Ligand binder design. Structure first.
Ligand SMILES: CCCCCCCCCCCCCCCCCC(=O)OC[C@H](COP(=O)(O)OCCN)OC(=O)CCCCCCCCCCCCCCCCC
Ligand SMILES: CCCCCCCCCCCCCCCCCC(=O)OC[C@H](COP(=O)(O)OCCN)OC(=O)CCCCCCCCCCCCCCCCC
Ligand SMILES: NC(=O)C1=CN([C@@H]2O[C@H](COP(=O)(O)OP(=O)(O)OC[C@H]3O[C@@H](n4cnc5c(N)ncnc54)[C@H](OP(=O)(O)O)[C@@H]3O)[C@@H](O)[C@H]2O)C=CC1
Ligand SMILES: CCCCCCCCCCCC(=O)OC[C@H](COP(=O)(O)OCC[N+](C)(C)C)OC(=O)CCCCCCCCCCC
Ligand SMILES: CCCCCCCCCCCC(=O)OC[C@H](COP(=O)(O)OCC[N+](C)(C)C)OC(=O)CCCCCCCCCCC
Ligand SMILES: CCCCCCCCCCCC(=O)OC[C@H](COP(=O)(O)OCC[N+](C)(C)C)OC(=O)CCCCCCCCCCC
Ligand SMILES: CCCCCCCCCCCC(=O)OC[C@H](COP(=O)(O)OCC[N+](C)(C)C)OC(=O)CCCCCCCCCCC
Ligand SMILES: CCCCCCCCCCC[C@H](O)CC(=O)SCCNC(=O)CCNC(=O)[C@H](O)C(C)(C)COP(=O)(O)O
Ligand code: SF4
Lengths: 175, 115, 155, 137, 359, 93, 80
């Protein structure tokens, strides 16, 4: 057959808009990502001492609600899952069931040392050494516990990633 | 306080013969719930398979001799019954319970690293 | 193109294929709504509302109330279609051909200077002319209140 | 009089309903776009019940069932007072005396349910106590 | 898998690198390899990638979809699974995923041409660029995946381009390259089965009369794993298929009967007799109106062609693995879509299969 | 009602017994369980539980050590057979 | 095609389904009454319709009250 693939055509995250369609599907991506950037509804998965900080963000001093963050208990209504606190072995199968029920798109934030890599209880017979063995993670917040601002900083960095989503342009250019 | 479903008092049995009859009823209790274990945990193996594995479990350790260690083996097997019948173990643990499992010559172990 | 006919044809289908008590309850609502709508137009608007306030608002949400306390368990397609198509051939509940296919009119009169709603006349008659009917119906409702307790209340 | 404007409103709301149904089927990114792991029907893990994470396997009391049944009488009582609302004047005193009788009969129904405590949920299955008494012999 | 995949702890590649595996084969063990799995984010890749990472082989997975690569990192340990953003039209990004790679696996293959790629441009143009670029970086081993009915002279676009994909690789990577032909695999969210479970399958009689040799995707996932760690299997052609022969129409009624799906099949749309021109016209019309990959004109022809076993190739037993039958695994993979559950065991599939064939 | 008779239990009992390793294929009322069929504890429990799955009758702990013949089980089912209660839909409509 | 009793096929196979059919049948008599009352321009017929709706309402309550007690009877063991 006849085939000729160029070589200097760049990757999607580096490819500039060229024609008018590349501006149309960038509008749809920004408009759609802006909706998810603002309506950032995590799930109250507080497990351990890290959960106290996740409450203090909702406290009047920081007021997560001002940024459009409204915790939703049910996984179906929550598009984020802030895994805060130690993930014991007795919990890990249950955590996977809660994660798999989140409709796409879905993000996971690992807050604190226990959720990241084991933390204090890394050498425990009944502690998962890092929740990344169970669910994919998009951002890691370091601390013990991370300060209420550190979680907000971790939220902001993930927001900056969501605003970089290019799904509807990917169909036009990478698919 | 009200004890949960399928509970028994922890008693230090001081008879060889009574322990024999306690076990025999227990083995039937597992077989009676053979259909349930398939439907409760959604196991891929049919009802006859579970009974086959349960029999392989009961046949395995029937030759123990110490009565003080008979009660301990009867006590913990009761807990395994109580945990399973009350639907306490997660689905994954039962699936992996039955999914567990000939050696190799010295040259085969020498080359790769043995243990 | 009376679109009222199509809706009944659908309801005449799901009634035959109804399997569990979910389907039968939905038949009741899907019967009331063509009743309510065809009464809102055409004949009487007052009783199109009086259906909704009483039928749906009192009995139908009591149907689904008890049904959740009852149970939830569990020819072909050409026969069901054949049954409907033959059942649809004749749809004249009357057989007075002159009375069906001839239209009429009424002549308005200006004598009733005291125009009032149809409900005001009903109240003006049910509360004065036929008060006995009203007072017996109250007595029946009293019987039900005492009747419903004795049947259900175990003690 | 003249409800053509209302009719168009009813049509518009009906048409607007489909727009709520259809807009999702067009705006959402396809399954391959986010993770491609599976369709809704195939993704049984997601398309399943939620029970706080752990998998599991309404016999309502008499009172709850009894309150619902007693709604049917009292609702027919209230909804049968509609004729008196639009004709409170013309029926005059005679309608007013009939109307009060139509309630006093229904008050006896109200009185009867009050005394028997039929509405209360009641707590008889539990909360029992006894006094310890020595039985010297 | 078992406990440790490598036959010997020290393995020398064709490039002279001396790789020593460490550990007892756990998550925290290593094997010293670096297997770049192109198209790893796909259905087949997520099995190829998973097995390689858990045993300690570094996996470089070039992706074009950003949100689909996140789940591949769970399988490996820290640094085991690596990511490179790329496109087949970006040559430089291709050379980023092969610079440190000792194993290069090719899985890229499409059935539907899009507004950016044709069937040839992917089964050949991607494969040719990938294979030739890997050689220039001193890649020791290349493994390739093609159709199960590769034929240079076939009138089907998929089979014609996939066959030429075998030639163009061997003229680019050279004698070292290997070609593996997988039969339609069945697994969770398998494209082979997703067509059978769909209720509204227009042209169901025509599409499902094709014949196949279904193979369990896990074994093919291990089939590449066995080949990866061995240098004895260079320059070969492998066709992997299952012993017991099944046809889609035999499966479709077998599938439906397990789900217990009187009047319903006649109404919901299970059997949609449609004219042959209409099927050809419908596929063409959607090809310019659709936005997601639909049923293609090419799969209208493939439905008339049955699977052919090639005797020049080598079976599973050549690698020491006995292929598993669809009977022992068909029930569990549709168990998501199904008083007392009836589990259709391995033998009882025939008794179901008996009930389908009986008129 | 209890529609099982003595013959019905006896006829269907053999088929279950023909499904397990039995020393002789001749089984009737007089046939034993431990002696004629050579069944030990675990072997005999599977057949006894199997008859519970077909005859739908539960054997208690009192009879456990007191079972010696297959006629007793056949006669036991008749004394302990009831039809499961049918919901309001099945019974009256 | 009503003389072949076709409506019996359209009824469900539970006691609650029989209750529904009766109320549909009684509702047919009210719609006929409203048809007769309106055309004649008679408010005596509309009084009859109001009574039919009210009376048929009570009958619904008594039927479900009996059914609920009947259904409770089967599950009336109350051992715990
Ligand atoms: C706003 C309109 C929304 C309509 C939603 C349902 C549309 C389907 C058509 C139903 C209306 C036709 C009239 C018959 C009443 C429904 C009886 C019925 O059988 O519904 C079937 C419905 C669809 O399921 P299906 O697969 O077709 O049947 C087999 C299901 N195992 O399965 C069901 O049991 C229905 C589940 C939802 C029940 C909601 C309450 C019923 C709908 C009330 C509003 C509709 C009013 C009627 C409109 C049509 C009037 C002719
Ligand atoms: C496109 C058309 C669609 C039409 C829809 C209906 C299709 C036909 C369905 C079956 C019709 C049978 C009934 C016919 C109508 C009822 C009888 C009737 O009204 O009379 C018509 C017919 C002849 O009447 P005719 O003599 O012409 O009267 C003229 C007087 N100037 O009377 C007859 O002689 C009919 C013969 C009836 C006698 C034999 C049957 C009765 C015995 C079996 C009854 C079944 C059991 C019922 C038991 C009663 C319960 C106690
Ligand atoms: N059981 C089966 O699935 C069958 C196996 N095969 C063949 O085996 C091979 C494995 O494919 P399989 O995983 O099973 O199915 P998929 O179609 O899901 O695999 C496609 C993979 O290759 C990528 N791909 C396709 N086109 C491009 C492109 N222009 N540029 C970059 N990447 C591209 C995809 O990227 P991405 O997904 O990230 O967009 C994906 O990673 C295929 O060739 C298939 O035809 C033969 C018959 C059926
Ligand atoms: C009613 C609809 C109003 C839309 C409001 C959201 C704007 C938006 O989504 O704008 C975001 C997008 C894209 O971002 P950009 O900054 O233009 O990217 C281009 C960056 N260059 C120019 C530096 C290369 O803009 C558009 O495509 C503008 C056209 C749509 C208006
Ligand atoms: C009818 C449908 C409902 C309403 C639709 C609107 C919903 C809200 C849209 C959110 C948009 C958004 O988020 O835009 C804001 C984001 C945030 O910037 P950033 O993501 O960091 O990239 C920007 C920086 N760059 C590109 C260098 C990396 O982009 C923009 O600054 C877009 C550019 C500004 C556009 C201004 C001109 C267009 C005006 C259009 C209005 C008349
Ligand atoms: C009001 C809301 C306005 C903001 C959202 C706009 C997004 C719509 C465009 C879009 O979805 O663009 C991407 C799409 C298809 O690409 P896909 O990734 O498969 O989209 C999945 C969408 N389905 C479900 C329609 C396949 O392109 C088109 O066919 C554009 C028409
Ligand atoms: C709603 C209408 C959907 C239109 C889709 C479309 O315009 O698609 C037309 C073509 C097809 O390309 P594709 O859909 O990516 O082909 C892959 C999918 N197949 C294999 C199913 C065909 O692409 C274009 O020329 C896109 C131009 C952008 C138009 C604005 C939207
Ligand atoms: C679905 C999940 C399923 C999960 C399933 C889980 C299965 C749990 C296995 C239970 C193991 C338990 O710890 C040990 C036990 O059963 S206690 C028997 C030990 N025995 C003695 O200590 C001396 C007395 N020994 C006898 O009486 C006879 O050996 C015998 C019992 C065979 C009677 O038979 P008869 O004499 O032929
Ligand atoms: S990381 Fe520290 S604060 Fe957070 S749960 Fe673990 S021990 Fe508690």
């Amino acid at each position: 057959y006849s085939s000729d693939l160029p070589t200097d055509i760049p990757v999607l995250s580096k490819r500039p808009h060229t024609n008018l369609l590349d501006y149309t599907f960038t509008t749809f991506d920004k408009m759609k990502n802006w909706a998810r950037k603002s309506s950032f509804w995590p799930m109250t998965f507080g497990l351990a001492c890290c959960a106290v900080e996740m409450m203090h963000v909702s406290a009047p001093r920081y007021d997560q609600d001002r940024l459009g963050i409204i915790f939703r208990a049910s996984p179906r209504q929550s598009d984020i899952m802030i895994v805060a606190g130690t993930v014991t072995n007795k919990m890990a199968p249950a955590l996977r069931q809660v994660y798999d029920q989140m409709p796409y798109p879905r993000w996971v934030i690992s807050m604190g040392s226990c959720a990241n890599g084991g933390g204090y209880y890394h050498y425990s017979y009944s502690v998962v050494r890092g929740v990344d063995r169970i669910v994919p993670v998009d951002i890691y917040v370091p601390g013990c516990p991370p300060t209420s601002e550190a979680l907000m900083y971790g939220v902001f960095q993930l927001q900056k990633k969501m605003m970089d989503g290019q799904t509807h342009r990917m169909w036009y250019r990478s698919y | 306080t009200n004890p949960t479903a399928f509970a028994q008092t922890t008693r230090y049995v001081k008879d060889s013969t009574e322990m024999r009859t306690l076990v025999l009823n227990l083995y039937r209790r597992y077989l009676r719930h053979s259909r349930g274990f398939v439907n409760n945990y959604n196991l891929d193996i049919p009802a006859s398979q579970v009974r086959t594995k349960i029999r392989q479990e009961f046949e395995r350790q029937r030759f123990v001799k110490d009565l003080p260690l008979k009660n301990v083996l009867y006590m913990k097997a009761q807990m395994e019954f109580q945990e399973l019948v009350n639907f306490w173990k997660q689905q994954c643990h039962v699936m992996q319970y039955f999914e567990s499992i000939k050696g190799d010559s010295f040259v085969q172990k020498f080359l790769k690293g043995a243990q | 193109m009376n679109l009222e006919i199509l809706d009944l044809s659908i309801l005449g289908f799901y009634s035959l294929i109804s399997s569990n008590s979910f389907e039968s309850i939905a038949i009741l609502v899907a019967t009331i709504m063509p009743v309510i709508t065809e009464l809102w137009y055409n004949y009487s608007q007052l009783f199109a509302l009086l259906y909704t306030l009483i039928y749906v608002g009192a009995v139908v949400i009591l149907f689904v109330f008890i049904l959740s306390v009852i149970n939830e368990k569990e020819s072909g397609l050409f026969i069901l279609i054949l049954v409907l198509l033959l059942d649809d051939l004749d749809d004249n509940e009357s057989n007075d051909n002159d009375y069906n296919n001839v239209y009429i009119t009424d002549y308005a009169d200006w004598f009733n200077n005291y125009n009032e709603s149809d409900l005001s006349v009903i109240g003006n008659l049910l509360f004065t002319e036929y008060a006995l009917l009203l007072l017996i119906i109250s007595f029946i409702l009293l019987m039900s209140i005492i009747g419903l307790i004795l049947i259900v209340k175990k003690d | 009089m003249l409800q053509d404007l209302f009719n168009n409103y009813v049509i518009l709301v009906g048409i607007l309903g489909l727009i709520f149904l259809g807009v999702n089927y067009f705006i959402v990114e396809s399954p391959r776009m986010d993770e491609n792991n599976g369709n809704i029907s195939d993704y049984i893990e997601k398309s399943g019940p939620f029970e706080c994470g752990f998998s599991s396997f309404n016999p309502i009391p008499i009172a709850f069932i009894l309150v619902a049944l007693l709604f049917l009488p009292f609702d027919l009582e209230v909804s049968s007072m509609l004729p008196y609302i639009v004709s409170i004047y013309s029926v005059g005193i005679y309608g007013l005396i009939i109307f009060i009788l139509f309630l006093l009969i229904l008050i006896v129904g109200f009185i009867y349910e009050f005394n028997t405590k039929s509405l209360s949920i009641t707590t008889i299955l539990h909360k029992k106590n006894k006094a310890l008494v020595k039985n010297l012999y | 898998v078992s406990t440790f995949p490598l036959k010997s702890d020290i393995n020398i590649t064709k490039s002279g690198k001396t790789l020593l595996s460490v550990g007892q084969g756990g998550r925290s063990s290593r094997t010293g390899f670096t297997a770049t799995v192109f198209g790893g984010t796909g259905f087949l890749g997520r099995v190829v990638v998973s097995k390689l990472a858990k045993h300690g082989t570094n996996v470089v997975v070039p992706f074009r979809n950003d949100r689909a690569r996140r789940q591949l990192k769970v399988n490996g340990d820290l640094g085991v699974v690596n990511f490179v953003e790329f496109d087949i039209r970006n040559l430089k990004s291709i050379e980023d995923s092969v610079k440190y790679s000792d194993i290069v696996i090719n899985l890229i293959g499409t059935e539907h041409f899009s507004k950016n790629f044709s069937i040839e441009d992917v089964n050949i143009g991607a494969a040719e660029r990938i294979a030739k670029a890997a050689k220039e970086a001193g890649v020791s081993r290349l493994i390739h995946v093609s159709s199960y009915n590769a034929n240079p002279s076939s009138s089907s676009d998929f089979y014609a381009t996939k066959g030429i994909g075998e030639q163009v690789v061997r003229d680019n990577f050279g004698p070292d390259a290997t070609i593996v032909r997988p039969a339609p695999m069945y697994f969770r969210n398998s494209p082979f089965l997703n067509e059978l479970l769909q209720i509204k399958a227009l042209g169901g009689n025509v599409i499902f009369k094709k014949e196949v040799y279904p193979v369990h995707a896990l074994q093919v996932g291990e089939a590449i794993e066995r080949i990866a760690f061995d240098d004895a299997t260079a320059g070969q052609t492998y066709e992997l298929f299952g012993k017991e022969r099944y046809s889609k129409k035999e499966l479709r009624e077998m599938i439906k009967h397990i789900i217990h799906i009187g009047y319903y099949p006649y109404s919901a749309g299970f059997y949609l007799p449609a004219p042959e021109p209409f099927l050809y016209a419908f596929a063409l019309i959607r090809q310019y109106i659709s936005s997601q990959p639909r049923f293609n004109v090419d799969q209208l022809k493939r439905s008339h062609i049955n699977q052919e076993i090639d005797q020049s190739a080598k079976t599973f037993t050549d690698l020491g693995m006995v292929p598993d039958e669809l009977s022992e695994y068909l029930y569990r993979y549709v168990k998501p879509h199904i008083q007392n559950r009836t589990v259709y065991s391995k033998e009882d599939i025939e008794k179901l299969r008996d009930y389908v064939n009986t008129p | 009602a209890s529609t099982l008779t003595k013959e019905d239990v006896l006829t269907r009992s053999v088929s279950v017994l023909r499904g397990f390793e039995v020393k002789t294929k001749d089984i009737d009322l007089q046939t034993t369980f431990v002696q004629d069929l050579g069944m030990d504890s675990l072997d005999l429990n599977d057949a006894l539980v199997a008859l519970e799955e077909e005859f739908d009758v539960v054997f208690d702990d009192k009879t456990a050590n007191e079972i010696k013949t297959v006629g007793e089980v056949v006669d036991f089912v008749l004394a302990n057979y009831l039809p499961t209660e049918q919901s309001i839909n099945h019974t009256i409509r | 095609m009503d003389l072949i009793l076709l409506m019996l096929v359209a009824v469900g196979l539970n006691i609650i389904d029989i209750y529904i059919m009766i109320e549909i049948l009684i509702m047919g008599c009210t719609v006929n009454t409203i048809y007769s009352a309106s055309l004649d321009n008679d408010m005596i017929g509309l009084i009859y319709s109001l009574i039919q709706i009210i009376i048929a309402g009570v009958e619904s309550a008594i039927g479900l009250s009996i059914l609920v007690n009947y259904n409770r009877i089967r599950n009336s063991e109350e051992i715990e």
